[PDB]
């Protein structure tokens, strides 16, 4: 699939794909994929839906990981999104109410959801928040490339493409870029914040996606 996804966008780059079961970073060079350099992020859709439950049981709501799984999943798909700057998001959640939304449940009783909206998807960037050793797609992608050939780096970085159900969270492309930049700056240019600016990353979120 990673091959085809690059096909549709009319290219022959890297493909970040995540569904319910798992996440895959498949870099593709002028033709096909290369197992070496191709990794897997062991956290996807489900794991976020599970976290959204621990977060809501923490709020004071009687959810059951099995009886209500499908219900919380729909809450995730409708309300969750990826924080850009977690420090700025926690402030919005702590100091104001602009994140609080109401969600009517199947039987009709209402519940309010706020900070949880971004905290759950955050698992993708801090696996430790749900007990999973890894460094999160952000850091992972950056190692699947930086570690690769030096003759494709620049090409790859300006050719990343999202794919799958767990990649439509609002703001994901933006967070990915901020992370990659942050990694580049320190881990590859020793914090020399001037040679930057000319670092080129273009993580595209295509609309045609469905098919």
């Amino acid at each position: 699939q990673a091959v085809l996804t690059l096909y549709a966008q009319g290219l022959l780059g890297v493909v970040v794909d995540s569904g319910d079961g798992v996440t895959h970073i498949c870099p593709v060079y002028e033709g096909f994929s290369l197992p070496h350099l191709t990794r897997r992020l062991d956290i996807a859709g489900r794991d976020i839906t599970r976290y959204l439950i621990k977060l809501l049981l923490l709020r004071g709501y009687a959810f059951n990981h099995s009886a209500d799984f499908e219900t919380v999943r729909m809450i995730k798909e409708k309300l969750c999104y990826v924080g850009y700057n977690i420090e700025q998001e926690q402030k919005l959640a702590l100091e104001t109410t602009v994140l609080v939304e109401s969600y009517t449940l199947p039987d009709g009783r209402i519940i309010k959801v706020g900070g949880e909206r971004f905290e759950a998807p955050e698992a993708l960037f801090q696996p430790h928040l749900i007990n999973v050793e890894g460094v999160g797609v952000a850091e992972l992608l950056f190692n699947t490339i930086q570690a690769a050939d030096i003759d494709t780096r620049s090409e790859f970085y300006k050719h990343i493409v999202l794919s799958g159900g767990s990649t439509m969270y609002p703001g994901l492309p933006s967070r990915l870029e901020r992370e990659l930049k942050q990694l580049y700056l320190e881990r590859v240019l020793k914090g020399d914040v001037e040679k930057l600016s000319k670092f080129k990353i273009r993580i595209e979120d295509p609309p045609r996606r469905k098919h």
Partner: protein, 134 residues
Amino acid sequence: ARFRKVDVGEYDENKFVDGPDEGEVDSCLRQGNMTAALQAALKNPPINTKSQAVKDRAGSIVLKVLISFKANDIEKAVQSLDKNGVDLLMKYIYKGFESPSDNSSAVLLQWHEKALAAGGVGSIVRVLTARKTV
């Protein structure tokens, strides 16, 4: 796992990037010529200087003319200014509000009342919209 500590956006090339004669005022103030002092303090505002020092100065002079006014003598003075003057006055009145003092604020609320009737709410808007201000 440090690296999220650096605010990368601060180096994003797509971002955005943007007094009067103290003696002349004193001269009219000592002579009791109030309307004149006002019109002099509202001249050549430090609209382009970087130091808050030169600006705080211009503000002081202007503020020293407003406080030095008699309640029933403000309406007249306001109406002697042109729209640009009214807009500039309004910017200073709002500056004065940041330095309350022995009734300094009680009279400034008089200048505001008068200035607004002349410049309309529009002048206040131009206080909120100014990128280069006093």
